[PDB]
Amino acid sequence: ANPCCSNPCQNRGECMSTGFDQYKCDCTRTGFYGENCTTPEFLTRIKLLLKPTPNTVHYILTHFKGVWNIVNNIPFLRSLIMKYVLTSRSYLIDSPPTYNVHYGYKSWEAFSNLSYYTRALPPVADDCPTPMGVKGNKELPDSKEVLEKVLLRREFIPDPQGSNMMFAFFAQHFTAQFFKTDHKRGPGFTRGLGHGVDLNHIYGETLDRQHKLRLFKDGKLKYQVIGGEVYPPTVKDTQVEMIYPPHIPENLQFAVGQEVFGLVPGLMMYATIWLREHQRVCDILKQEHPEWGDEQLFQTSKLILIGETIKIVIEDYVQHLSGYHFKLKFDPELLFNQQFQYQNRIASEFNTLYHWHPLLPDTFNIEDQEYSFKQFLYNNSILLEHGLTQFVESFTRQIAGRVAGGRNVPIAVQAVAKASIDQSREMKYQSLNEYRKRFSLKPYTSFEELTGEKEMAAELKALYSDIDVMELYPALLVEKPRPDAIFGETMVELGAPFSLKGLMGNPICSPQYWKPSTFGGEVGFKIINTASIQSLICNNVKGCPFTSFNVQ
């Protein structure tokens, strides 16, 4: 009944009810006007005519490799370009944050309560006739139906961009610090009150935890040495609340920042690598500052790893994902003369789009062994059995599945894919097309346009009837990928802005923090600025195995 149920206001104008059956659009700063903020202001028109589409830009960035080569070697140019890509995203995210699962209108509760994931688009009001507002039927199509018909994997579809298991697990480990859904509260709630890259998955969300994981000597983290190898400490020793199935051997009950990594050998591998890297940095800083104590050594090392993490995620992780010939760059300075807010609140939608399960292979091949999902979750012995070196060599070789494309979600994890659908509905997410508009993308006019094919499109048409009622999550996994890419337009365009805010919005990226003294000097600052996924592994994995996010 809410007069705003149809999402009448366009171009980001805000809808407000003015009576039981009337609404008004607030076109403030939208660059448009009119009842629905659709009539463009001269300049708006000018601007629109000069903005190239994401696909045009993606094309240019993935061609002319030759010129990108010269650019990649002209620091000034490279900076110049990276600045464009940075600021081009900027105007997209609301910061300070606005809506959340419970507030379709700005409120102090929505703003102040850090326990909620924020929302890029407000929820669909509870009193709307249909789930997407007023379009579609009283009900959205059965999620099991959608799941099976177009999401489930028949034959493994390998990622054309070459993503491997090193990448798949890094994605899982990394995002685990900020996507920590508070299940006891609901899908729209989080336990990551830091709302970003704070590395709480290494150090713990709370002081009490952090303290239990620290050695309180040289600023280091506690650790045990098994067979000459450094691994996280045990639960018996640290007493960090964490309860493993009772059969797990004592020394195999690792204590790490994130209480959920302890299961997966692949997650525990990164946990071990970063723990190792912390100590490494501690040793380096101690050498430079024989006069420092444990606290500063610890704190300064944590600041450096946060920087290393952001450096790697931009120049290695995102670089890979992008497919660009242009070398992405981590340079906070690029934003210093720009209007930018050094704050971030994780969006529910960022969490949703990130459900990249099709990445998972059907089996995990380590050395000669091949493990099923069942024997590769909760079994830390595999890691101790093969060792970090073998794990790296193996994960570097194994290719990951394509995400966009359609039908590539491993059946072994189908309940997770169904939950994404079910939960998005719970949090009353708006349609795929509403989110596309929300991000300056042209809405799709047909399911065939979305998938770029006929079979799945037809099955989707059968289930949804109207493209304007199509859901965001399923659409992301079925969307026509880009030329030999892992993702389609919608995934890149919604995720990029969320990522930039989470990465560049970190305090250490702000002017007052971005200086050598913040990281113990030029030495510590260099660790951040020369960081790469290869260095991280090389420095912390016996043998310095070669590694990258793509399968050679």
Partner: peptide
């Protein structure tokens, strides 16, 4: 690169 080269040797 540089680190991999010397450390791998």
């Amino acid at each position: 690169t540089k680190t991999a080269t010397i450390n791998a040797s």
